[PDB]
Amino acid sequence: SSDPLVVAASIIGILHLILWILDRL
Amino acid sequence: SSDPLVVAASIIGILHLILWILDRL
Amino acid sequence: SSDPLVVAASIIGILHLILWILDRL
Amino acid sequence: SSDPLVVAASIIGILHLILWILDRL
């Protein structure tokens, strides 16, 4: 639904950002 | 409006993150 | 404040995502 | 909790975006 989709997209973005920061370190 | 713009930006960010994750895989 | 900071960070992230998508195209 | 985690992920994403923009400049 409109609430579970926005949540899922947010979690995906956060995971990608954390991975990128770990690569730069 | 102030509600549709923040939603659109969020969807754009999520799509970009998904694409990046697919490239890394 | 706690409301203007989260908004500013969100706009910054959206602009960065749009720029990245334009580079990939 | 479900409120502190979403906030933390958001801050992490914003910091990563700012760093990327600084590198492009």
Contact D5, A5 (CB under 8 A): no
CA nearest to A13, candidates D21, C6, B1, D8 = D8
D13 and A14 within 8 Å at the Cβ level: the answer is: yes
What technique determined this structure? NMR
Task: Give the E-state strand segments of chain D in sequence order.
Answer: none
Q: Which two tokens stand for residue D23?
A: 């590198």
Q: Which two tokens stand for residue A22?
A: 């770990």
Contact C3, D8 (CB under 8 A): no
Q: Which two tokens stand for residue C23?
A: 């580079």
| Number of structural domains found in chain A | 1
User: CA separation (Å) from D10 to A13, B1, B23, D14, D25?
Assistant: 9, 22, 23, 6, 23
Q: CB within 8 A of B20, min separation 6: which ones?
A: A16
Structural domain including A3 reads: 1-25
If you write DSSP's letter for every residue of chain B in order, what string do you get? Answer: -HHHHHHHHHHHHHHHHHHHHHHH-
Residue numbers in A near B17 (CB within 8 A): 9, 12-13, 16-17
